Design an enzyme around this catalytic site. Sequence first.
Site, PDB file in Angstrom:
ATOM      1  N   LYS A   1     -14.335   9.809  12.365  1.00  0.00           N
ATOM      2  CA  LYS A   1     -14.003   9.678  10.955  1.00  0.00           C
ATOM      3  C   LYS A   1     -15.219  10.048  10.123  1.00  0.00           C
ATOM      4  O   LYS A   1     -16.360   9.805  10.522  1.00  0.00           O
ATOM      5  CB  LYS A   1     -13.540   8.260  10.609  1.00  0.00           C
ATOM      6  CG  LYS A   1     -12.530   8.209   9.480  1.00  0.00           C
ATOM      7  CD  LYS A   1     -11.157   8.635   9.960  1.00  0.00           C
ATOM      8  CE  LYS A   1     -10.344   9.232   8.831  1.00  0.00           C
ATOM      9  NZ  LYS A   1      -8.900   8.899   8.955  1.00  0.00           N
TER      10      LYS A   1
ATOM     11  N   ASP B   1      -7.948  14.424   4.658  1.00  0.00           N
ATOM     12  CA  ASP B   1      -7.589  13.028   4.435  1.00  0.00           C
ATOM     13  C   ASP B   1      -7.400  12.776   2.946  1.00  0.00           C
ATOM     14  O   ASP B   1      -7.196  13.723   2.180  1.00  0.00           O
ATOM     15  CB  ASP B   1      -8.641  12.090   5.023  1.00  0.00           C
ATOM     16  CG  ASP B   1      -8.049  10.778   5.495  1.00  0.00           C
ATOM     17  OD1 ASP B   1      -6.856  10.533   5.221  1.00  0.00           O
ATOM     18  OD2 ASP B   1      -8.769   9.996   6.145  1.00  0.00           O
TER      19      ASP B   1
ATOM     20  N   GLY C   1       9.148   4.858  -0.765  1.00  0.00           N
ATOM     21  CA  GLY C   1       8.111   5.848  -1.041  1.00  0.00           C
ATOM     22  C   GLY C   1       8.718   7.226  -0.874  1.00  0.00           C
ATOM     23  O   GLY C   1       9.361   7.537   0.127  1.00  0.00           O
ATOM     24  N   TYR C   2       8.512   8.070  -1.883  1.00  0.00           N
ATOM     25  CA  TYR C   2       9.104   9.401  -1.897  1.00  0.00           C
ATOM     26  C   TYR C   2       8.045  10.480  -2.070  1.00  0.00           C
ATOM     27  O   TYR C   2       8.247  11.443  -2.815  1.00  0.00           O
ATOM     28  CB  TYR C   2      10.168   9.514  -2.987  1.00  0.00           C
ATOM     29  CG  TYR C   2      11.276  10.480  -2.645  1.00  0.00           C
ATOM     30  CD1 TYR C   2      12.114  10.247  -1.563  1.00  0.00           C
ATOM     31  CD2 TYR C   2      11.485  11.624  -3.400  1.00  0.00           C
ATOM     32  CE1 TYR C   2      13.127  11.124  -1.245  1.00  0.00           C
ATOM     33  CE2 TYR C   2      12.497  12.508  -3.089  1.00  0.00           C
ATOM     34  CZ  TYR C   2      13.315  12.252  -2.011  1.00  0.00           C
ATOM     35  OH  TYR C   2      14.325  13.129  -1.697  1.00  0.00           O
ATOM     36  N   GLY C   3       6.911  10.336  -1.392  1.00  0.00           N
ATOM     37  CA  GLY C   3       5.908  11.380  -1.385  1.00  0.00           C
ATOM     38  C   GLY C   3       6.266  12.467  -0.396  1.00  0.00           C
ATOM     39  O   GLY C   3       7.447  12.678  -0.108  1.00  0.00           O
ATOM     40  N   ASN C   4       5.250  13.112   0.167  1.00  0.00           N
ATOM     41  CA  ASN C   4       5.459  14.164   1.154  1.00  0.00           C
ATOM     42  C   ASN C   4       6.098  13.602   2.422  1.00  0.00           C
ATOM     43  O   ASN C   4       7.041  14.182   2.961  1.00  0.00           O
ATOM     44  CB  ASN C   4       4.132  14.845   1.492  1.00  0.00           C
ATOM     45  CG  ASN C   4       4.320  16.137   2.260  1.00  0.00           C
ATOM     46  OD1 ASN C   4       4.408  17.216   1.673  1.00  0.00           O
ATOM     47  ND2 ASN C   4       4.384  16.036   3.582  1.00  0.00           N
ATOM     48  N   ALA C   5       5.581  12.472   2.895  1.00  0.00           N
ATOM     49  CA  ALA C   5       6.100  11.830   4.097  1.00  0.00           C
ATOM     50  C   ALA C   5       7.499  11.276   3.869  1.00  0.00           C
ATOM     51  O   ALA C   5       8.407  11.513   4.672  1.00  0.00           O
ATOM     52  CB  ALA C   5       5.149  10.722   4.550  1.00  0.00           C
ATOM     53  N   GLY C   6       7.699  10.548   2.769  1.00  0.00           N
ATOM     54  CA  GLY C   6       9.001   9.947   2.521  1.00  0.00           C
ATOM     55  C   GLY C   6      10.096  10.976   2.297  1.00  0.00           C
ATOM     56  O   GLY C   6      11.187  10.878   2.870  1.00  0.00           O
ATOM     57  N   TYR C   7       9.818  11.978   1.458  1.00  0.00           N
ATOM     58  CA  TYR C   7      10.815  13.007   1.181  1.00  0.00           C
ATOM     59  C   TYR C   7      11.171  13.781   2.441  1.00  0.00           C
ATOM     60  O   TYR C   7      12.352  14.003   2.734  1.00  0.00           O
ATOM     61  CB  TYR C   7      10.312  13.965   0.102  1.00  0.00           C
ATOM     62  CG  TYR C   7      10.996  15.313   0.144  1.00  0.00           C
ATOM     63  CD1 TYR C   7      12.319  15.456  -0.251  1.00  0.00           C
ATOM     64  CD2 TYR C   7      10.323  16.441   0.600  1.00  0.00           C
ATOM     65  CE1 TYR C   7      12.949  16.684  -0.205  1.00  0.00           C
ATOM     66  CE2 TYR C   7      10.945  17.672   0.649  1.00  0.00           C
ATOM     67  CZ  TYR C   7      12.258  17.788   0.246  1.00  0.00           C
ATOM     68  OH  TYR C   7      12.882  19.013   0.291  1.00  0.00           O
TER      69      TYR C   7
HETATM   70  N1  LIG Z   1      -0.864  11.628   3.833  1.00  0.00           N
HETATM   71  C1  LIG Z   1      -0.562  11.936   5.210  1.00  0.00           C
HETATM   72  O1  LIG Z   1      -0.767  13.071   5.622  1.00  0.00           O
HETATM   73  C2  LIG Z   1      -0.027  10.892   6.150  1.00  0.00           C
HETATM   74  C3  LIG Z   1       0.091   9.629   5.582  1.00  0.00           C
HETATM   75  N2  LIG Z   1       0.238   8.379   6.299  1.00  0.00           N
HETATM   76  C4  LIG Z   1       0.548   7.166   5.578  1.00  0.00           C
HETATM   77  O2  LIG Z   1       1.717   7.193   4.900  1.00  0.00           O
HETATM   78  C5  LIG Z   1       1.937   6.809   3.617  1.00  0.00           C
HETATM   79  C6  LIG Z   1       2.398   7.898   2.669  1.00  0.00           C
HETATM   80  O3  LIG Z   1       1.714   9.102   2.854  1.00  0.00           O
HETATM   81  P1  LIG Z   1       1.734  10.148   1.698  1.00  0.00           P
HETATM   82  O4  LIG Z   1       2.973  11.052   1.828  1.00  0.00           O
HETATM   83  O5  LIG Z   1       0.437  10.991   1.740  1.00  0.00           O
HETATM   84  O6  LIG Z   1       1.787   9.386   0.316  1.00  0.00           O
HETATM   85  P2  LIG Z   1       1.768  10.137  -1.061  1.00  0.00           P
HETATM   86  O7  LIG Z   1       0.414   9.886  -1.762  1.00  0.00           O
HETATM   87  O8  LIG Z   1       1.990  11.660  -0.883  1.00  0.00           O
HETATM   88  O9  LIG Z   1       2.895   9.565  -2.013  1.00  0.00           O
HETATM   89  C7  LIG Z   1       2.994   8.181  -2.197  1.00  0.00           C
HETATM   90  C8  LIG Z   1       4.457   7.798  -2.300  1.00  0.00           C
HETATM   91  O10 LIG Z   1       4.623   6.417  -2.103  1.00  0.00           O
HETATM   92  C9  LIG Z   1       4.947   5.923  -3.385  1.00  0.00           C
HETATM   93  N3  LIG Z   1       4.262   4.670  -3.656  1.00  0.00           N
HETATM   94  C10 LIG Z   1       2.849   4.374  -3.882  1.00  0.00           C
HETATM   95  N4  LIG Z   1       2.777   2.993  -4.088  1.00  0.00           N
HETATM   96  C11 LIG Z   1       4.129   2.486  -3.984  1.00  0.00           C
HETATM   97  C12 LIG Z   1       4.588   1.236  -4.104  1.00  0.00           C
HETATM   98  N5  LIG Z   1       3.702   0.141  -4.374  1.00  0.00           N
HETATM   99  N6  LIG Z   1       5.818   1.044  -3.972  1.00  0.00           N
HETATM  100  C13 LIG Z   1       6.747   1.931  -3.722  1.00  0.00           C
HETATM  101  N7  LIG Z   1       6.390   3.283  -3.579  1.00  0.00           N
HETATM  102  C14 LIG Z   1       4.974   3.496  -3.731  1.00  0.00           C
HETATM  103  C15 LIG Z   1       4.629   6.975  -4.395  1.00  0.00           C
HETATM  104  O11 LIG Z   1       5.430   6.889  -5.513  1.00  0.00           O
HETATM  105  P3  LIG Z   1       5.184   7.784  -6.778  1.00  0.00           P
HETATM  106  O12 LIG Z   1       5.886   9.102  -6.599  1.00  0.00           O
HETATM  107  O13 LIG Z   1       5.739   7.117  -8.005  1.00  0.00           O
HETATM  108  O14 LIG Z   1       3.709   8.036  -6.964  1.00  0.00           O
HETATM  109  C16 LIG Z   1       4.994   8.158  -3.640  1.00  0.00           C
HETATM  110  O15 LIG Z   1       6.362   8.272  -3.606  1.00  0.00           O
HETATM  111  C17 LIG Z   1       0.566   6.277   3.346  1.00  0.00           C
HETATM  112  O16 LIG Z   1       0.525   4.908   3.474  1.00  0.00           O
HETATM  113  C18 LIG Z   1      -0.320   6.942   4.380  1.00  0.00           C
HETATM  114  O17 LIG Z   1      -1.419   6.177   4.672  1.00  0.00           O
HETATM  115  C19 LIG Z   1       0.011   8.653   7.680  1.00  0.00           C
HETATM  116  C20 LIG Z   1       0.427   9.846   8.170  1.00  0.00           C
HETATM  117  C21 LIG Z   1      -0.199  11.082   7.632  1.00  0.00           C
HETATM  118  O1  LIG Z   2      -5.122  14.625  11.464  1.00  0.00           O
HETATM  119  C1  LIG Z   2      -6.235  14.258  11.897  1.00  0.00           C
HETATM  120  O2  LIG Z   2      -6.892  14.920  12.728  1.00  0.00           O
HETATM  121  C2  LIG Z   2      -6.810  12.956  11.396  1.00  0.00           C
HETATM  122  C3  LIG Z   2      -6.123  12.566  10.093  1.00  0.00           C
HETATM  123  C4  LIG Z   2      -5.853  11.081  10.096  1.00  0.00           C
HETATM  124  O3  LIG Z   2      -6.762  10.293   9.897  1.00  0.00           O
HETATM  125  C5  LIG Z   2      -4.499  10.595  10.340  1.00  0.00           C
HETATM  126  O4  LIG Z   2      -3.605  11.416  10.638  1.00  0.00           O
HETATM  127  O5  LIG Z   2      -4.267   9.371  10.244  1.00  0.00           O
END
Ligand SMILES: NC(=O)C1=CN([C@@H]2O[C@H](COP(=O)(O)OP(=O)(O)OC[C@H]3O[C@@H](n4cnc5c(N)ncnc54)[C@H](OP(=O)(O)O)[C@@H]3O)[C@@H](O)[C@H]2O)C=CC1
Ligand SMILES: O=C(O)CCC(=O)C(=O)O
Length: 416
Positions: free
Chosen positions: A102, A142, A216-222
């Site tokens: 890390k 990250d 959660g509807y970010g990249n992972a959720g969607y």
């Molecule tokens: N980022 C990655 O590549 C990966 C992520 N993870 C884990 O997964 C989770 C999501 O990843 P990621 O796609 O990057 O997240 P994002 O930053 O892309 O998006 C966050 C999403 O979760 C929502 N959110 C944030 N806080 C809350 C809350 N209190 N209640 C309800 N919804 C909430 C956001 O809503 P809004 O649209 O309103 O902002 C948005 O929909 C994280 O916890 C992360 O640690 C692990 C795998 C890899």
């Molecule tokens: O994808 C990687 O190599 C490390 C990123 C990371 O910390 C994770 O996926 O939780």
Amino acid sequence: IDPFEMAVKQLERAAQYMDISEEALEWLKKPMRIVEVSVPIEMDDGSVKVFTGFRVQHNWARGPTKGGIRWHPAETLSTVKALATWMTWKVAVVDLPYGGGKGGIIVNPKELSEREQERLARAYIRAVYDVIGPWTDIPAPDVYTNPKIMGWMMDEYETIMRRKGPAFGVITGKPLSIGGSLGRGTATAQGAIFTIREAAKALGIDLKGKKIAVQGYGNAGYYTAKLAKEQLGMTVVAVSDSRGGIYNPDGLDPDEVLKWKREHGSVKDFPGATNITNEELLELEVDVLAPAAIEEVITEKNADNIKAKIVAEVANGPVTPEADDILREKGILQIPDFLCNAGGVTVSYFEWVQNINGYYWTEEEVREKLDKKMTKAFWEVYNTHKDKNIHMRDAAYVVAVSRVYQAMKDRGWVKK
Ligand SMILES: NC(=O)C1=CN([C@@H]2O[C@H](COP(=O)(O)OP(=O)(O)OC[C@H]3O[C@@H](n4cnc5c(N)ncnc54)[C@H](OP(=O)(O)O)[C@@H]3O)[C@@H](O)[C@H]2O)C=CC1
Ligand SMILES: O=C(O)CCC(=O)C(=O)O
């Protein structure tokens, strides 16, 4: 609460369920190498600012260490150490020839220019070059770090190394134009979907026409909701964001929900769907629940009210240990957090393999290999779950620590 002590106590709890020597546990309780460097960059106003950078290599018994780089103003050495320790088990549970690593820089990138960000990346590479490499330490994107920074870092590493080896393989998450890999964008969701399908197979229930709720509807959720709807044929009945959530028993179209989120700024007030709260979404009666949002959404307060048969922890630790106990007593199968979202690091491993070999795969090959890796890892974890009569999280920890311990013993690092 110190993030390092927390990881150490987690490791001790894992060791409590397995036969591991005290010397091996003490070895695993301490990172094998920690590097703290000063990162000087030239600001746009002409002054010179010095930042603090970290690169923790927890353990490399199984192979080169792997882990992302964080650019957060609140980043600390303990956080980097805990995340490297965590990454060790994450790469061990999915059987990659990797260790735990890390990195991080204490910086607020929201107030840095593009040129300043490039200078920061290049200076970080110049500072940590002596401890990184294609076969020593492979950084990754990250929080607040994107593939653009990966491209800059790879270019700086190639410049320093004088092109004497596979400079593309020194870092993952690169743009497709320079050593990038297909399937990176949807890696986490695809791995989560594979784990959900394997869990459904283990429980003897088909997912055709079933209900899935995603928090959660970010990249992972969607992408989780989408991939579920197409590949698994499940009916997405509820999605939510930090702002709010929506529910519809007739189902939802993920593309339309994303379009409305990207237009009005939130998934709220979607046509044909009633507005609900995140807690209401969590307690909805479904067959698969996939929290893909902030951590600690399932706690002792609401664990007893959950009605989902499968809880897929796409996010990082959305369930507290008391909630694990409550859900396990309730008969709800849990997919451990660092097993469900292991698709991203697997896809990262695939990118490193492609860079090392000089030959790049297609989307289908990456998808198929990810399917194999996730299926094998989940079945190993579930078999440990049933054989040892412990929690799924405990089984995943046992598998990862057992692999690392076996690798350490085979090298002769620990004699017992
Ligand atoms: N980022 C990655 O590549 C990966 C992520 N993870 C884990 O997964 C989770 C999501 O990843 P990621 O796609 O990057 O997240 P994002 O930053 O892309 O998006 C966050 C999403 O979760 C929502 N959110 C944030 N806080 C809350 C809350 N209190 N209640 C309800 N919804 C909430 C956001 O809503 P809004 O649209 O309103 O902002 C948005 O929909 C994280 O916890 C992360 O640690 C692990 C795998 C890899
Ligand atoms: O994808 C990687 O190599 C490390 C990123 C990371 O910390 C994770 O996926 O939780």
